[PDB]
């Protein structure tokens, strides 16, 4: 009736969308290698004829919190966490390379080295790392080196079999995909294996969600959402009053 009803409804609707984004971070506080998503608003003006008075706002995800997560000491040989900045190259079910930080590795019956989510871990050959089947001691090196001990071999028969592919690209050039894997924004760009990233074995990296930061932004979203809803109510109240012009 006044077009400020929809100008306030759009603000209220977008505040809900940001609320959904923040609610996902709090649901994933204990997730392993989880990078908290950011949420903000962008002021888009309705350029055209008339007075410049109508400006819309839509929520967006400008980036992610790439800070180091919470490191959990598990005392497990197949548990590794990236020291500082870095990534682990994995391929999902489709077979597409993606950067993850879930260092909760495991070995299946065939010997393939996967993580807790089932993604195959890549190596120096750029193929998934496959270990000999009858292992007796698996130790992950500081720089991603995988050294195994054949079953029944003496303690001096320690040899490396593969190297974990660690990638350290620019963080702002990465986007989280639909399955939680970070990839390059520019397609068909190779993930160069970095020789600086270090793995702190014997530990698992948790999420970096700042729980208090999420809550203090939730209380702001509620207030801004409710103010716009009152604008919707005052918009219809004005329309009802102006309806008496034609009455006679």
């Amino acid at each position: 009736m006044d077009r400020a009803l929809f100008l306030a409804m759009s603000g209220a609707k977008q505040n809900m969308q940001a609320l959904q984004l923040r609610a996902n971070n709090l649901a994933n506080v204990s997730t392993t290698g989880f990078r908290a998503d950011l949420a903000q608003a962008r002021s888009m003006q309705a350029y055209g004829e008339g007075h410049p008075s109508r400006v819309f706002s839509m929520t967006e995800r400008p980036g992610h919190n790439f800070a180091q997560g919470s490191v959990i000491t598990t005392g497990r040989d197949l548990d590794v966490t990236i020291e500082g900045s870095g990534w682990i190259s994995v391929l999902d079910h489709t077979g597409k390379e993606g950067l993850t930080r879930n260092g909760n590795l495991k070995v299946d019956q065939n010997g393939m080295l996967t993580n807790a989510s089932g993604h195959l871990v890549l190596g120096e050959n750029d193929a998934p790392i496959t270990l000999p089947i009858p292992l007796s001691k698996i130790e992950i090196g500081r720089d991603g080196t995988i050294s195994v001990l054949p079953q029944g071999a003496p303690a001096e028969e320690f040899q490396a079999v593969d190297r974990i592919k660690l990638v350290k690209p620019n963080d702002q050039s990465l986007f989280k995909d639909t399955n939680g894997l970070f990839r390059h924004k520019t397609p068909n760009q190779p993930y160069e294996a970095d020789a600086t990233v270090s793995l702190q074995t014997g530990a698992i990296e948790g999420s970096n969600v700042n729980a208090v930061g999420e809550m203090t932004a939730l209380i702001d979203l509620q207030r801004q959402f409710e103010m716009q809803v009152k604008m919707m109510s005052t918009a219809e109240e004005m329309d009802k009053s102006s309806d008496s012009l034609l009455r006679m």
């Binding site: 350029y47 055209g48 004829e49 008339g50 007075h51 410049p52």
Partner: peptide, 11 residues
Amino acid sequence: GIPGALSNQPP
């Protein structure tokens, strides 16, 4: 003419 008014056309 209000000095320094906003405009209504893409910058």
